[PDB]
UniProtKB/Swiss-Prot annotation, chain A:
The lineage of its organism: Eukaryota, Metazoa, Chordata, Craniata, Vertebrata. Ubiquitinated; STUB1 likely mediates polyubiquitination of PD-L1/CD274 triggering its degradation. Ubiquitinated by MARCHF8; leading to degradation. Deubiquitinated by USP22; leading to stabilization. Interacts with PDCD1. Interacts (via transmembrane domain) with CMTM4 and CMTM6. Interacts with (phosphorylated) STAT3; promoting nuclear translocation. Interacts with CD80. Belongs to the immunoglobulin superfamily. BTN/MOG family. Glycans are attached at N18. The chain holds residues 19 to 134 of 290 of the full protein. Plays a critical role in induction and maintenance of immune tolerance to self. As a ligand for the inhibitory receptor PDCD1/PD-1, modulates the activation threshold of T-cells and limits T-cell effector response. Through a yet unknown activating receptor, may costimulate T-cell subsets that predominantly produce interleukin-10 (IL10). Can also act as a transcription coactivator: in response to hypoxia, translocates into the nucleus via its interaction with phosphorylated STAT3 and promotes transcription of GSDMC, leading to pyroptosis. It comes from Homo sapiens (Human). It is linked to Truncation of the 3'-untranslated (3'-UTR) region of CD274 transcripts leads to elevated expression of CD274 in multiple cancers including T-cell leukemia, diffuse large B-cell lymphoma and stomach adenocarcinoma. Disruption of 3'-UTR region is caused by structural variants that stabilize CD274 transcripts, leading to overexpression. Increased expression in tumors promotes immune evasion and tumor cell growth by allowing malignant cells to escape destruction by the immune system. This is Programmed cell death 1 ligand 1. Highly expressed in the heart, skeletal muscle, placenta and lung. Weakly expressed in the thymus, spleen, kidney and liver. Expressed on activated T- and B-cells, dendritic cells, keratinocytes and monocytes.
Curated annotation (Swiss-Prot), chain B:
Glycans are attached at N18. It is linked to Truncation of the 3'-untranslated (3'-UTR) region of CD274 transcripts leads to elevated expression of CD274 in multiple cancers including T-cell leukemia, diffuse large B-cell lymphoma and stomach adenocarcinoma. Disruption of 3'-UTR region is caused by structural variants that stabilize CD274 transcripts, leading to overexpression. Increased expression in tumors promotes immune evasion and tumor cell growth by allowing malignant cells to escape destruction by the immune system. The chain holds residues 19 to 134 of 290 of the full protein. Belongs to the immunoglobulin superfamily. BTN/MOG family. Disulfide bonds join C23-C97. Highly expressed in the heart, skeletal muscle, placenta and lung. Weakly expressed in the thymus, spleen, kidney and liver. Expressed on activated T- and B-cells, dendritic cells, keratinocytes and monocytes. This is Programmed cell death 1 ligand 1. Ubiquitinated; STUB1 likely mediates polyubiquitination of PD-L1/CD274 triggering its degradation. Ubiquitinated by MARCHF8; leading to degradation. Deubiquitinated by USP22; leading to stabilization. The gene is CD274. Induction: Up-regulated on T- and B-cells, dendritic cells, keratinocytes and monocytes after LPS and IFNG activation. Up-regulated in B-cells activated by surface Ig cross-linking.
């Protein structure tokens, strides 16, 4: 069966750093880009959509603009890796990577964000 | 674009009855089952998986045992309908219909559960 796997289903990262959350699917041969679909979301807001070799960002949620990229470089390795830069406190939650490449499956990844008092306090108001 | 559509994205049902929540996907002429993949989840609790023309119950969440069917007949019509029987108070929430058939898409459906005092009282006391 075609199954998406997640090497680590929980990440805890420090406010303001960068994170790469990985999502693995089988790639036996050379990648067939036109058969590939990658959807990354967080809660119910789109982070990246990838169909026919191109990222589509019309969908992408405000709070992910210019901070979220899919390392297409790893896709040929079978790795839909999402890179978030300048991790905010509002990035903590459940992410889902959904992959269709001759079959389909999806997996959740939970992200916790440690933060110093100051950043938490400004998130508070 | 491959688009899953939901004719009704809100359902109101009475406790202990059955509900059928509707989810439609494009099929022009006769269906290719080896390409069809349907997942019904509810707030990240797996309800149904349908792969290779077979429902997969290996991931089915405890609370949906033998209460959930996918109407296998109407799949050729472009109809992924999830059928829940003996609707519980914990069946209220956001459902998600995920469909891969060449393209891929998913849609949410909210379900509210009306229940009389006694049933709500046992649910409250759980
Ligand atoms: C949230 O909506 C989505 C979701 C998309 O992947 C959703 C997606 C992507 C990959 C695999 C599985 C899947 C996983 C397990 C079981 C069944 C399917 C799923 C649901 C792609 C989209 O775009 C291609 C759009 C956008 N709508 C527009 C109308 C469109 O499809 O053009």
């Amino acid at each position: 069966a075609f199954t998406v796997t997640v090497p680590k289903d929980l990440y805890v990262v420090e406010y303001g750093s960068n994170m790469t959350i990985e999502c693995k699917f089988p790639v036996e041969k050379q990648l067939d880009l036109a058969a590939l679909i990658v959807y990354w979301e967080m809660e119910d807001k789109n982070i990246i959509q990838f169909v026919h070799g191109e990222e589509d960002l019309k969908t992408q949620h405000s709070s992910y603009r210019q901070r979220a990229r899919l390392l297409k470089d790893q896709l040929s390795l079978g790795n839909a890796a999402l890179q978030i830069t300048d991790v905010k406190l509002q990035d903590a939650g459940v992410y889902r990577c959904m992959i269709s490449y001759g079959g389909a499956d999806y997996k959740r990844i939970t992200v916790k964000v440690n933060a110093p008092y100051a950043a938490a306090l400004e998130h508070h108001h």
